[PDB]
Amino acid sequence: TLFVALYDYEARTEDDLSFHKGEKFQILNSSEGDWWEARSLTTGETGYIPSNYVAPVDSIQAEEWYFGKLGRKDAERQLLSFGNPRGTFLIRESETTKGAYSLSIRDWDDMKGDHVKHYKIRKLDNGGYYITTRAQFETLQQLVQHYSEKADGLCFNLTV
Ligand SMILES: [Cl-]
Ligand SMILES: [Cl-]
Ligand code: NA
């Protein structure tokens, strides 16, 4: 299972690798702490990388729209950045229910101007993830794909 760089990183020691976001790696040793021995799949070089800078290639952490540990207010601050159109979104962990998630979407209306709507993503015990009783999804990726086509109850369509 490959790992993917979530951010750019510049070597800080002789034994560290430098890499750009999206670069792929094979992990060789992840047992001697926060710094893992890896092989770059662009240069073939072996060295140490910060573990918090990488995630498994098919993980939720690797998704462009997933911002795990981001809070509600900082989600608003991030989506209300310049250039993000109506429908720009992100998925983050729920601050109220462990194992639940939150879908934050940039929207616009008459009373509030540019604002953000938050939708809690729950998970059924013998089922998948859902916002409505209408549909449930085995993964968060499938949920994003579903609401990317039409809003289906949501304030606006997901701009992916
Ligand atoms: Cl970066
Ligand atoms: Cl850096
Ligand atoms: Na991500």
Curated annotation (Swiss-Prot):
Asked whether the UniProt record includes NAD among its keywords, one would answer no
Processing after translation: Phosphorylated at tyrosine residues, which can be enhanced by NTN1.
Q: Where is the SH3 domain?
A: 1-59
Primary localization class, coarse: cytoplasm
| One GO CC term, this protein | cell body
Compartments in which it is found: Cytoplasm; Nucleus; Cell membrane; Perikaryon
GO MF terms, alphabetically ordered: alpha-tubulin binding; ATP binding; CD4 receptor binding; CD8 receptor binding; disordered domain specific binding; ephrin receptor binding; G protein-coupled receptor binding; growth factor receptor binding
Q: Which residues carry this modification: Phosphotyrosine?
A: Y101
The tissues where this chain's protein is expressed are given as: Isoform 1 is highly expressed in the brain, isoform 2 is expressed in cells of hemopoietic lineages, especially T-lymphocytes.
What keywords were assigned to this record?
Adaptive immunity, ATP-binding, Cell membrane, Cytoplasm, Developmental protein, Immunity, Kinase, Lipoprotein, Manganese, Membrane, Metal-binding, Myristate, Nucleotide-binding, Nucleus, Palmitate, Phosphoprotein, Proto-oncogene, SH2 domain, SH3 domain, Transferase, Tyrosine-protein kinase
Summarize subunit and interaction data from the UniProt record for this chain.
Interacts (via its SH3 domain) with PIK3R1 and PRMT8. Interacts with FYB1, PAG1, and SH2D1A. Interacts with CD79A (tyrosine-phosphorylated form); the interaction increases FYN activity. Interacts with TOM1L1 (phosphorylated form). Interacts with SH2D1A and SLAMF1. Interacts with and phosphorylates ITCH, down-regulating its activity. Interacts with FASLG. Interacts with RUNX3. Interacts with KIT. Interacts with EPHA8; possible downstream effector of EPHA8 in regulation of cell adhesion. Interacts with PTK2/FAK1; this interaction leads to PTK2/FAK1 phosphorylation and activation.
Mind telling me what this protein is named? Tyrosine-protein kinase Fyn
Species the sequence originates in:
Mus musculus
Question: Which part of the full protein does this chain span, and how long is the full protein?
Answer: 85 to 244 of 537
